[PDB]
């Protein structure tokens, strides 16, 4: 079974996600307005990204063991997993009806044309959509969603890490919870290699990250475009 500490970890991660994720998307009215008719969607989406980073930061601080890390290990982990964890948390609004992210209204319904009007090409967007579809098909419990997001943040393989053993032991505690949770709470056939498919998704995110790094560096090459971004977005990415 799931032990008391493992139940504790889950209760924490769920509540931490409930406090950083507003399924009504109310605060979307504060972003620079979307324009759909080049880079005409970069201001609105740069804003949603900047907001999303703040939300991921607030979630990170609630991960049991994250507070034991040094301020520097804390910065390296969040800096490299930011786009990955935002990709993961976006799956909660992604709809397979039309392959898009549906955030309340038609104005905040983003599709492949909107993401391409943010200055990014199909080389990344096609794998991004395929990723969201494969994640949706896993039909994870909200508990599995929060654990995966936590495991993706506390990864010891991220370059610049100092106390790799500490990050490792924090992640193992989250991994074991997840593995136990699938075996105790998740029933067949949905549980079938569900853990291995969840880890595969983490690998698909490493690929999406690496391509993101490239297309971001070319988009932000021209000052006219990094001029449309946010201070936080520029600090996290470059």
């Amino acid at each position: 079974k799931l032990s008391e500490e493992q139940q504790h970890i889950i209760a924490i991660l769920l509540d931490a996600h409930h406090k950083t994720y507003d399924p009504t998307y109310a605060d979307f009215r504060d972003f620079r307005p979307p324009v759909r008719m080049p880079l005409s969607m970069l201001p609105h989406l740069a804003d949603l990204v900047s907001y999303s980073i703040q939300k991921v930061i607030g979630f990170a601080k609630m991960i049991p063991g994250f507070r034991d890390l040094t301020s520097d290990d804390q910065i390296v982990l969040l800096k490299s997993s930011a786009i990955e964890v935002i990709m993961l948390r976006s799956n909660q609004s992604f709809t397979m009806d039309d392959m898009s992210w549906d955030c309340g209204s038609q104005d905040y319904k983003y599709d492949v044309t909107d993401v391409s009007k943010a200055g990014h090409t199909l080389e990344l967007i096609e794998p991004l959509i395929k990723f969201q579809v494969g994640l949706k098909k896993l039909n994870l419990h909200e508990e599995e969603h929060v654990l995966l997001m936590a495991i993706c943040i506390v990864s010891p393989d991220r370059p610049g890490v100092q106390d790799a053993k500490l990050v490792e032991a924090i992640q193992d505690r989250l991994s074991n919870t997840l593995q136990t949770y699938i075996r105790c709470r998740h029933p067949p056939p949905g549980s079938h290699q569900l853990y291995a498919k969840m880890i595969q998704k983490l690998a698909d995110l490493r690929s999406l990250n690496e391509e993101h790094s490239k297309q971001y560096r070319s988009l932000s090459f021209q000052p006219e475009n990094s001029m449309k971004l946010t201070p936080l977005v520029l600090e996290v990415f470059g």
Binding site: I57, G58, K61, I75, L78, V236
Partner: peptide
Amino acid sequence: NHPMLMNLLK
């Protein structure tokens, strides 16, 4: 140097 990031985490 990541002042905004260190602030949000403090």
